[PDB]
Amino acid sequence: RVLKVFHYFENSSEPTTWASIIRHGDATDVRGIIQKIVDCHKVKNVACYGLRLSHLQSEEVHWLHLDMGVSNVREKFELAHPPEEWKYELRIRYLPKGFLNQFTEDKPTLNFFYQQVKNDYMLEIADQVDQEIALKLGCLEIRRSYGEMRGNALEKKSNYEVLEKDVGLRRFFPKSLLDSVKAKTLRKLIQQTFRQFANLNREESILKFFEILSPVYRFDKECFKCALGSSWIISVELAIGPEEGISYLTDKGANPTHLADFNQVQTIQYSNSEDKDRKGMLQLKIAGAPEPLTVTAPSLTIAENMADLIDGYCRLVNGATQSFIIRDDYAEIISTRDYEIQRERIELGRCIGEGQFGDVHQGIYMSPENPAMAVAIKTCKNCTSDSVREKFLQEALTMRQFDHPHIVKLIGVITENPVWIIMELCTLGELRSFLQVRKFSLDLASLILYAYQLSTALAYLESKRFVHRDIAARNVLVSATDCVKLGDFGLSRYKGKLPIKWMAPESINFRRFTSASDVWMFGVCMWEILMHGVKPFQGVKNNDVIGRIENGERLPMPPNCPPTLYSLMTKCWAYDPSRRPRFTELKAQLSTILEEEKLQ
Amino acid sequence: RVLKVFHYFENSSEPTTWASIIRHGDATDVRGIIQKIVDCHKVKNVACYGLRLSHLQSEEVHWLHLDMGVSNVREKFELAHPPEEWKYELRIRYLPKGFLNQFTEDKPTLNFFYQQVKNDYMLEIADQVDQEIALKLGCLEIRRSYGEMRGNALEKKSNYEVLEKDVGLRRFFPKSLLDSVKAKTLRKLIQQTFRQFANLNREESILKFFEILSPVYRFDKECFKCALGSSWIISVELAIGPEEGISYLTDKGANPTHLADFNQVQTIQYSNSEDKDRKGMLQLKIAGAPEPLTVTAPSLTIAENMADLIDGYCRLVNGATQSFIIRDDYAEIISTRDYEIQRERIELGRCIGEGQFGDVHQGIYMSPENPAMAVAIKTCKNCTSDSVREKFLQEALTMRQFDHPHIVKLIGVITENPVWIIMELCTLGELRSFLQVRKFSLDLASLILYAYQLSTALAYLESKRFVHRDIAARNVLVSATDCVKLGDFGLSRYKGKLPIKWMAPESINFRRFTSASDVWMFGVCMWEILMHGVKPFQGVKNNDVIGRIENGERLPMPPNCPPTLYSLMTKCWAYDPSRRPRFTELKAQLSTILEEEKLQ
């Protein structure tokens, strides 16, 4: 049985992309796997790093016990949700007393905990923190990453051009700050802050990083809510760490009133709550008392997590090896999820048209699972107005939640100015001019398949209920001679002109837009595609269009059109907009039509 | 157990890319699987199509018996070679008497056998055939593909522009012809030949296609060699088909002297030869004789194939269902190989430099396994000289036979003028200017890894023994900040100047080129990369270079160089070219060096 886990050993992959695959037997346990993981890099620690499981799209996690079976976990939890909704995480949870000291004598673990909790910082508090503290941490971090760099290194206009045009600091500084300061102001901030820590080293700036995290966050511990009392039971926030032993707060900045110490601990055991409330009990034994301390947490999950907490501090600061929780195996290093998008992995190509929001370009992206994917990049001329920004976001988030082949697929975004788009390229481009140039060359079966694929697509829209209102051949976009993907999906309000010849009477008259007008504009779409690209009513006004529809006048058949094909088109020409049939009907009909076409 | 087979039912995929996956149980047999395959498209035939297995990189095939287990085959043959060296092939082998008639009443099978043996034609005989016959078949084929197209359709300069700039006819006409005729001459050939069959249909031009294959190839049968005689044994070429029954030739164009007919057949059985010769025996029974006809083939393989031959004609033209070879299963439609490269799937991008053979461009390719891969495209200014053409081929075929990640990988070629290249893109480009611009920004660990990857690469060269002679930083080429792939691999002879400062003394003096100079130029490569791109001996002649080496003068260390790093560089600076150590030594050393670097 093989396994994938993200680790926090350094490589050239991204600072949050330190991954490996470990192959282990059923007998292998979380404690056993960590042995391999650490022996990959010669760490001085035997019973320190724990293992955390985690849901990708949620803040729920599960620290896990040692002797458990890997496959037993993978069962017990993947049976709940897919592996795209589970994630192992190798991590510290434990720290000896002067951990700065005990693992300043352990440099790999020094950098390990460093990168780890620095990450957690950038996750939770970077966008919150003071400007000044951010600059402190950031220039100490320059000193970290650049171990042999000069102290006058960043004194140059050239270097500034580097750091802005090449590096960029979404890795390092927060969105909150960087979208709050002038370019030149930010420069001189970084200057003055780079002056002072000009010549430290790793270990030095590392312990300074911890000193600066101290006032703003007590990473020595975690913070859990609970309510204690055998008999009258009393909410507290039992935040436990090596810095105190066992204590609790009655105010924010209080020194928590002390109870006991890890060295005083003797035993652990937990079970479900006394009742059907979704909670669990956790009895303990502390050194030399007749006296059980019993915490109760909002979940048996957290009951087990605090069981692991205490047992692992026992492993940590005592020589304890067995679990205090009274309830040839050998691993060798070998759909719907969160997407992270940076800027560095991008080609800045040539102009590929002139669009609605603005000009558009193509380029590349790189990633570990699949890389070097050249794409279209939908963009805008001006990003000054937040309304256009929001619609520019809205098309993206709209097309996000779909899951389909012949839907055109965004991959994600870079949400700083100039915000860009990752549209997997509509290669041959505008189906209109495409088929205009390819008039005397193409095959009606392929036209039937164009209609078929678009049928299945807009059918899936109705199955998940979105309305486009502006479907057009110029909005149809192409991948190949055997693939045309639905494109655009944008909102624009509110005057003239409008694609009247495409539109339905209800819309043309009083802005009514439903599945009826949807089927009608799909009808004109199928039509014009099947026309070899001939538009409706050449040289005619958009004014008489409504008059001639309400006169019942309809578009003539194409030359050499198939019977069933135009039959379905006329089914879609029900003057009663309500009566025009459904997209599932379009699917089944056009399906059987192409069946008989292939039958010839 | 699932399964993949290429079928010959039509789709929008390429004419030779008609593939499907079938999922079947162990109980499923080749005869049983074909039921699903045909019921996908409503064919009128129950016991007609056979199954052929085939090696990709060889002309060996294996027609297979009905009641055999699919997985039994997949075992019995994949245990011999990988699935990249095996291939199922659903095919006709059988034809009733006036098969043109019996399957002109079966239009799906009409087009099936049509496309099948037309393919085989384009495989074997298209490059051989007469000009005129080729044009005949090709314009009948225009009529085939274009079923509703006009008869005056290709009368236009415009259409000619279409067929040359968009379609192209490697699908349809041979290399031999198309690289034998002027563009305009070929045009008018196609014109005059398109005039005459201007208005047939499928079925008509189909049977004409068969009429034109008749004089040039007897597709009614296959042709096997054997030697017959119970007692004195006599080489013949027993080519059997429904057109004759059983016969044989004594000359090329002879009417083969007849022996027996399929209706006369009674039984089959085969076994190995009488002796250790790699052959097999095949006894038969024919209607109303005391008399065994015993063929002997060069292989038991072909013994079984002719057993299947006869038993399948029995199934064909008789109502026989059981095998005459006397020796809930249900399938549902769901490294190192031959590469086919066309032109249509290509982007024609912008200029991306100015190279040795000629200018160079980037672009895209599309394929079923992986598509839309944007790449570099190495090209040439002039393809007039066949020597430059051969070297342009030689670099390609050179880099073909490797198998490695950090070797730069061609994907293949289009071997008509202008012949092009598919280099998976060296993205960030020239490592020289790259690192020149990124001087004050980069990390020595990444430089160590540059050296490491190049070490492993040229080490693999030595493991498979190729010599480059011209390794340079300008020849080093980049993918990323964590990937640099070996590039170029070209031959150019034979005056000045030369990269003398890179080269070794033996070469500079008398054109000696071995692993010694290899290690030296790798040394200068590592050096200059580690220099932050500083070249050797600025403003110095290439003349005094040899004098100063033979004076023992060496390059100074870099500023802030690591000890072990320059130590290994000086190991490579052994003035005795023989004594400069090996690339496996470079691997192990630089490995442990980066180990200790990550250790810090």
From Swiss-Prot, chains A, B:
It is a peripheral membrane protein. GO terms for biological process: actin filament organization; angiogenesis involved in wound healing; epidermal growth factor receptor signaling pathway; negative regulation of anoikis; negative regulation of cell-substrate adhesion; negative regulation of protein autophosphorylation; positive regulation of cell migration; positive regulation of cell population proliferation. The modification Phosphotyrosine is found at Y330. Residues 1-321 form the FERM domain. ATP binds at I352, G353, E354, G355, Q356, F357, G358, K378, E424, L425, C426. The active site is at D470 (proton acceptor). Keywords: Angiogenesis, ATP-binding, Cell junction, Cell membrane, Cell projection, Cytoplasm, Cytoskeleton, Developmental protein, Kinase, Membrane, Nucleotide-binding, Nucleus, Phosphoprotein, Transferase, Tyrosine-protein kinase. Phosphorylated on tyrosine residues upon activation, e.g. upon integrin signaling. Tyr-330 is the major autophosphorylation site, but other kinases can also phosphorylate this residue. Isoform 2 is phosphorylated on serine or threonine residues, but apparently not on tyrosine residues. GO terms for cellular component: cell cortex; centrosome; ciliary basal body; cytoplasm; focal adhesion; nucleus; perinuclear region of cytoplasm; plasma membrane. Residues 346-594 form the Protein kinase domain. Its EC number is 2.7.10.2. GO terms for molecular function: ATP binding; calcium-dependent cysteine-type endopeptidase activity; identical protein binding; integrin binding; molecular function activator activity; non-membrane spanning protein tyrosine kinase activity; protease binding; protein tyrosine kinase activity. Subject to autoinhibition, mediated by interactions between the FERM domain and the kinase domain. Activated by autophosphorylation at Tyr-330. Inhibited by TAE226. It comes from the Eukaryota. Its main location: other. The keyword Glycosyltransferase does not apply. It is an enzyme of class 2 (transferase). It is found in: Cell junction, Focal adhesion; Cell membrane; Cytoplasm, Perinuclear region; Cytoplasm, Cell cortex. The C-terminal region is the site of focal adhesion targeting (FAT) sequence which mediates the localization of FAK1 to focal adhesions. Belongs to the protein kinase superfamily. Tyr protein kinase family. FAK subfamily. Interacts with ARHGAP26, GRB7, DCC, PIK3R1, PXN and SRC. Interacts with the ARP2/3 complex. Non-receptor protein-tyrosine kinase that plays an essential role in regulating cell migration, adhesion, spreading, reorganization of the actin cytoskeleton, formation and disassembly of focal adhesions and cell protrusions, cell cycle progression, cell proliferation and apoptosis. Required for early embryonic development, embryonic angiogenesis, normal cardiomyocyte migration and proliferation, and normal heart development. Regulates axon growth and neuronal cell migration, axon branching and synapse formation; required for normal development of the nervous system. This is Focal adhesion kinase 1. It comes from Gallus gallus. The gene is PTK2.
